[PDB]
Design a protein around this ligand. Structure first.
Ligand code: NI
Length: 341
């Protein structure tokens, strides 16, 4: 049965609620982005209307085989009527195709559902500036002050410099990057660009990337492993065993692997600077864990919420324990008392 935080009061709408069967009263199912916890339950046998971005729509059709007739893509930054309710989709600065959804209820209440997001100051000059928000359905993944990590720009700078240095010293070194979902494409694309290479990957991952509307993508990726010195592999293969096995497969073309594991937050963040990160090494294999986040840091989240000044906050992440829920409620009250709303 569908939890309260996936229901939109005063509508027949749900958000990211496809694993509960037919939801009584739901006339339109919104999907914020193509991550499996959020789409869990959709398949080619779904027959209710699905509203989403163009990109999410490409992925539902090609990867999940949902039928065309039930896919409803909406452009971003555009007032749209759905089943007689005005809605707007906003870029969530998460993975490709990810949105936030603004709902303008028939009684005058305005609701923002963030989906998954990485808050940014640029959101303060979107259509959110223009009117008041009563209720906020908030991605609270990292809602605790221990959660620090650097900017995406700093992390990409570290990766580009690390890779270019290693391959310029040893032209026979291979770079490998792990992936298990869409998102974080900048990691492998920025590294391949500095090396003057395409990125090689499986047929299944190539297909996924072809759904994402990335400009000039045909110039950046390929299924021909041999021609490429940046390879993508499943995240589960990013360990000494998996990589050894992969190097065997390249037929004596390379004698060193340098590998990247983009993680979310890891406790090494509370002591160390990005500059000072060191790999795990065994032999001719080095693995770097880099903190490339597509969710808000605690400070970014706090800034956003203090700017928006919502009347009520409903968390959508970390909701399963009493201790989590109580901790999040304490920070919302500090923020409100500090800012005066
Ligand atoms: Ni996500």
């Amino acid at each position: 049965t569908c939890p309260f935080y996936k229901k939109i009061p005063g509508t027949g709408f749900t958000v990211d609620a496809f694993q509960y069967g037919v939801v009584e009263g739901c006339t339109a199912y919104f999907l914020t982005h193509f991550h499996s916890d959020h789409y869990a339950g959709l398949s080619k046998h779904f027959t209710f209307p699905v509203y989403c971005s163009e990109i999410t729509g490409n992925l539902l059709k090609n990867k999940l085989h949902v039928q065309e007739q039930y896919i409803h893509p909406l452009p971003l930054d555009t007032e749209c009527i759905v089943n007689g309710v005005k809605v707007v989709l906003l870029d969530a600065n998460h993975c490709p195709g990810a949105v936030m959804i603004l709902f303008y209820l028939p009684n005058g209440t305005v609701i923002l559902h963030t989906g998954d997001f990485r808050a940014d100051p640029s959101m303060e000059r979107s259509l959110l500036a223009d009117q008041k928000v009563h209720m906020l359905y908030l991605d609270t993944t990292y809602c605790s002050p221990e959660y620090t990590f650097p900017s995406q720009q700093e992390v990409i700078r570290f990766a580009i410099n690390t890779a270019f240095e290693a391959v310029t010293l040893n032209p026979h070194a291979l770079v490998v990057c792990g992936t298990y979902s869409i998102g974080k494409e900048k990691v492998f694309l920025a590294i391949a660009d500095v090396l003057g290479s395409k990125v090689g990957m499986s047929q299944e991952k190539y297909k996924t990337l072809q759904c994402l509307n990335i400009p000039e993508i045909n110039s950046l990726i390929t299924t021909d492993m041999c021609s490429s010195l940046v390879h993508l592999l499943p995240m589960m293969q990013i360990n000494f065993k998996g990589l050894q096995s992969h190097l065997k497969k390249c037929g004596g073309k390379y004698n060193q692997i340098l590998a990247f594991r983009p993680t979310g937050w890891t406790h090494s963040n509370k002591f160390t600077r990005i500059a000072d990160v060191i790999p795990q090494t065994k032999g001719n294999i080095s693995i770097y864990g880099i903190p490339y986040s597509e969710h808000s840091s605690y400070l970014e989240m706090k800034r956003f919420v203090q700017w928006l000044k919502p009347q009520k906050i409903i968390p959508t992440v970390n909701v399963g324990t009493w201790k989590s829920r109580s901790t999040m409620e304490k920070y919302f009250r500090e923020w409100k008392l500090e800012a005066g709303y």
